[PDB]
Write a protein that binds this ligand. Structure first.
Ligand SMILES: [Cl-]
Lengths: 459, 445
């Protein structure tokens, strides 16, 4: 009575439950509820992953299977770490990400190192730090992405930096230069020699080294597109160039059951009956504690001038829910008051909701996910919290420009160029001519960010 | 049924007071039906009011009587104390008018006509601003010469043209003589009564011979006094009604069930207090009002949505409930949302919040709080009462069901008019008992 055959729960591998083929089927459902449920809470993305990307991800998983932690190839590769140089090609190459910086930085920078692994046929290993395995499920079918806790160099991670004799930028400075491993300082404070990571010739050298250790707090994807060789491959992986983090972030990052219960209970209690949901991600960079009136004006001005929220009259509708995230409750409270106190000019019903005000990282992650479930999103300038949320949702946000001198900016916001995050500390260096250059004005699809003019983003 | 089983008269202008009839779309129908005798009493009141009300010829002529056996008698309610007290003590004075065939006139204070529509079809209930004793209202107290207690004391007791009745909580044994039958017979001849009170004094009227027989006919269900008279008298203005409908629509209208938690803490420190948070979780859980949460990884196998409407000056109690229902799954699978309208348009919002609490299915209230008495009475809700803590210790048991939906009278007289001696007026008849929350109060049951 063998009837998988005639009635297989056969799955379209490009179903919306698998995000159009981005995700593999076959994971254990129970141990990561969020993985295949993103569909019950979100709308399907209009941005479809390319067949080339899908095959690249299926084949990465093959590589991760063969070379992943605890495999015999992994244990054999570890032995190269014992000597300073190697006697021939191992079968497996690695890039290890050190858990460093805030949660927004870690999501974006881990997405960047993963793209890099894809571009260099390396296996990604993840330093779990204090919490990575409490926040996120396993993303690679059949294997773990976590660095083993007995990895020999883990106790060096914290102290690795620019003057470490293994730092690639250190070696370049002191004109010293196959190595068994190499540390890449890619933290935002890195310098000219560290930035040589983004040169074609240096990547040829680095490509030979079996183990790379990366410390980074930046979304450095953009500058990868200005590297000969990588450019052709990226062009094929992402026909729509500003979908990099939308695809890789959705592929890599799935909240654990503990975090996902925060998302689903909040959505089901507070958000699920609205016809439309507006996200307002508020971040105020300022030592003083808010809330600030000029920021409240900025928010009112932005959402009303863009027709996101109705004006009120101080003198069968649709129901719109507003999800506000912020350290200070004051902005949400002010919106909540206004729409309680006065009728809307349009007749629309407006509800205002904020999850939390100042399990901390699990709530932060839940709130990024909740924002990613909204229909239209307003973000804060310079906020990686917003970049994560906009990217997971495929949302081209409206950006609340950074105020100067506590004056409401005019315009208070404007539409982003694309949904992509911003790379805050890009190199400005022409590798071929060996000279300074404006990397925001080389190619049409790499521009300076709307919100931090030094930075670069994909458009 | 917009007319609440005959309690309300048809024919008001709808658009000028949307709440009057449009509130049928926001509450369940009340199971308590006004007696036929009450309905007649109210229609005939409205006739009396049309005939004697402000701006009539009969009013102008009665005014002249104050300058020193006519056909119009009145009782004037002075706007005094907080909103809760005002609503309850106004309902009490209206009952008194019904019992003594008087016209009720309302001193509008700073805000009464900003908060409430006109209750009496085709006349106004507001005292005219040019009423001649208005400037005296503030000063009137137990030392006024026309204070009834001040006359029982000096023994100064023709028919007087007017009398002031001191019925504030600080009144004394001579003031309290108002609640005796013989004093009522004297007071009953005076054409103008002025009352200042902050108490719900209804239950003691049931202990006065003569009033007792009438009250029995008006309210065969004795504990419906405030529920019927309060829904008859108090209709939020369009301004206030918009606070109600907007909040209801945005936050409460999709729930299968609504729980009101009316939090008032009588303390110097603003709080919040963990002993009060513990009282609330314990009360709502032990009474099956809200579900328990739990810490099990393995979950058991659609869910009802409950909205919890919390009112309090401080946001901390609602924030504590909201966090707990965010951070942990419910043991029942039920979906819990927690909502608080405001934290420290003040009186407008106060009235709307009382009105929203009256919209819930089950209600928790705070001991001693007239804010909660108004909510429960308008809603026809018999509450669970969070008892008043002592020494910042969570009461045990944390709460109990009220005996009835009626408010409590905080400052009753304790006096046998006939034997001319003190007595416990909470032990005379079975329908007037000591309150659950304040042991020397009285309430109807
Ligand atoms: Cl180069």
């Amino acid at each position: 009575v063998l009837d998988a055959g005639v009635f297989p729960n056969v799955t379209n591998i490009n179903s919306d439950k698998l995000l159009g083929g981005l995700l593999a089927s076959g994971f254990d459902e129970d141990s990561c509820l969020s993985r295949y449920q993103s569909v019950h809470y979100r709308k399907p993305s209009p941005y479809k992953p390319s067949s080339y990307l899908i095959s690249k991800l299926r084949n990465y998983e093959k590589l991760h299977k063969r070379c992943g932690p605890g495999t015999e190839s992994y244990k054999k590769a570890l032995k190269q770490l014992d000597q300073e140089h190697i006697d021939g090609d191992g079968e497996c190459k690695y890039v290890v990400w050190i858990s460093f910086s805030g949660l927004g930085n870690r999501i974006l920078s881990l997405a960047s190192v993963f793209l890099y692994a894809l571009l260099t046929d390396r296996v990604l290993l993840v330093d779990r730090g204090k919490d990575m395995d409490d926040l996120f499920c396993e993303p690679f079918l059949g294997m773990s992405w976590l660095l083993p806790l007995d990895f020999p160099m883990t106790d060096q991670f914290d102290g690795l930096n620019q003057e470490s004799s293994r730092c690639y930028g250190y070696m370049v400075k002191n004109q010293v230069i196959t190595l068994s491993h190499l540390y890449l300082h890619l933290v935002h404070d890195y310098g000219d020699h560290d930035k040589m990571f983004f040169c074609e010739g240096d990547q040829t050298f680095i490509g030979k080294v079996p183990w790379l250790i990366v410390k980074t707090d930046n979304y450095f994807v953009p500058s990868l597109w200005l590297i000969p060789g990588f450019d052709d491959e990226l062009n094929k992986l992402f026909p729509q160039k500003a979908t990099v983090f939308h695809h890789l972030g959705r592929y890599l990052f799935h909240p654990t059951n503990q975090v996902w219960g925060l998302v689903t209970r909040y959505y089901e209690a507070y958000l699920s009956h609205a016809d439309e949901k507006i996200g307002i991600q508020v971040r105020v960079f300022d030592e003083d504690p808010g809330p600030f009136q000029h920021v409240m004006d900025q928010i009112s001005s932005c959402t009303q001038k863009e027709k996101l929220l109705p004006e009120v009259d101080t003198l069968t509708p649709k129901h719109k829910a507003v999800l506000v995230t912020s350290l200070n409750a004051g902005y949400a409270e002010n919106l909540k008051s206004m729409y309680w106190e006065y009728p809307t000019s349009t007749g629309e019903i407006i509800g205002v909701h904020q999850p939390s005000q100042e399990m901390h990282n699990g709530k932060a992650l839940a709130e990024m996910y909740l924002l990613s479930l909204t229909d239209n999103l307003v973000t804060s300038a310079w906020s990686t919290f917003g970049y994560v949320a906009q990217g997971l949702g495929g949302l081209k946000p409206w950006i609340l420009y950074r105020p100067e001198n506590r004056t409401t900016p005019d315009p208070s916001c404007g539409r982003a160029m694309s949904m992509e995050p911003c790379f805050h500390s890009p190199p400005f260096y022409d590798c071929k001519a060996k000279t300074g250059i404006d990397t925001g004005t080389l190619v049409p699809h790499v521009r300076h960010c709307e919100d931090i003019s030094w930075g670069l983003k994909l458009v």
